[PDB]
Ligand binder design. Structure first.
Ligand SMILES: Cc1c(NC(=O)c2ccc(C(C)(C)C)cc2)cccc1-c1ncnc2[nH]c(-c3ccc(C(=O)N4CCN(C)CC4)cc3)cc12
Length: 262
């Protein structure tokens, strides 16, 4: 899994993430790569390195591939597949047109295929959201940074009352009991479907976290976006059942999305 850093050519800045600076470059003077330059103290590096092989073996066309690591210099590097059109959240917000409903469903289908693959490997994403999905040059959506949440060293992110914790993508059992399962990714996926159909709006925009939790407890959920048909809304709504066991699997959600696609 150890990539020779001499095989990397750093070419551009690609902004920052939870682990700091990310750059764009070439691997073997030919393949586009994103290179995460891990800020010292931001990550459980040893744990990530000892568990990374699992992640490098997660290969599906709709997952942003982890290619390898460079751990013999400061900072260490995580080398991944490069996505030409950046994160899905910015893509939805910056496009000028009102997306065709078929294209929006296609984004949902792409994410659902990646998630069905992760579910088949009993591998949780833990931070599924439009900000963690990327888009390629053909408008194909891919799921990024799956499982990396586990290696974050930052209480504002890892604590359910922290400023960076994905509260609005979390089911009640995560918020009350820290109980993660395949069903917490299902809940997050429903919120992601809502982000896609609302063209990148923040979920529960008018509510504080405590108002959101009270809205949920009373049986209220995110409203049906203008672009989502009643059938599409039934799919995202099924992800938010109060009882984790009543939520569908990604295999079932994919079958539902394909039926709506016709
Ligand atoms: C994934 C990733 C992260 N994210 C992380 O490290 C990270 C995230 C979450 C976590 C936790 C789960 C632990 C919270 C950890 C780490 C951070 C910076 C870069 C990238 C990144 N990785 C791969 N490909 C990329 N492309 C871009 C990209 C950005 C902007 C443009 C752009 O300016 N335009 C304008 C022109 N228009 C035509 C196209 C778009 C293009 C490409 C970014 C990519």
């Amino acid at each position: 899994w150890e990539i020779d850093p001499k095989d990397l050519t750093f070419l551009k800045e690609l902004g920052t993430g939870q682990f700091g600076v990310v750059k764009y470059g070439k691997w073997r003077g030919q393949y586009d790569v994103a290179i995460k330059m891990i800020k010292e103290g931001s990550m459980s590096e040893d744990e990530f390195i000892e568990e990374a092989k699992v992640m490098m073996n997660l290969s599906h066309e709709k997952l942003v591939q982890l290619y390898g690591v460079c751990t013999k210099q400061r900072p260490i590097f995580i080398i991944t597949e490069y996505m030409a059109n950046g994160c899905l959240l910015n893509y939805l917000r910056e496009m000028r047109h009102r997306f065709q409903t078929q294209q929006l469903l296609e984004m949902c289908k792409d994410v659902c295929e990646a998630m069905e693959y992760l579910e088949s490997k009993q591998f949780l994403h833990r931070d599924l959201a439009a900000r963690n999905c990327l888009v390629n040059d053909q408008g194909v959506v891919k799921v990024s940074d799956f499982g990396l949440s586990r290696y974050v060293l930052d209480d504002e992110y890892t604590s359910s009352v922290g400023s960076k914790f994905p509260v609005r993508w979390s089911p009640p059992e995560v918020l009350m009991y820290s109980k993660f399962s395949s069903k917490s990714d299902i809940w997050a996926f429903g919120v992601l479907m809502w982000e896609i159909y609302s063209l990148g709006k923040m979920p529960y925009e008018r509510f504080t976290n405590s108002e959101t939790a009270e809205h949920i407890a009373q049986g209220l959920r995110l409203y049906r976006p203008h672009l989502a048909s009643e059938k599409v809304y039934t799919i995202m709504y099924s992800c938010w059942h109060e009882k984790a066991d009543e939520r569908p699997t990604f295999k079932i959600l994919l079958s539902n999305i394909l039926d709506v696609m016709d």
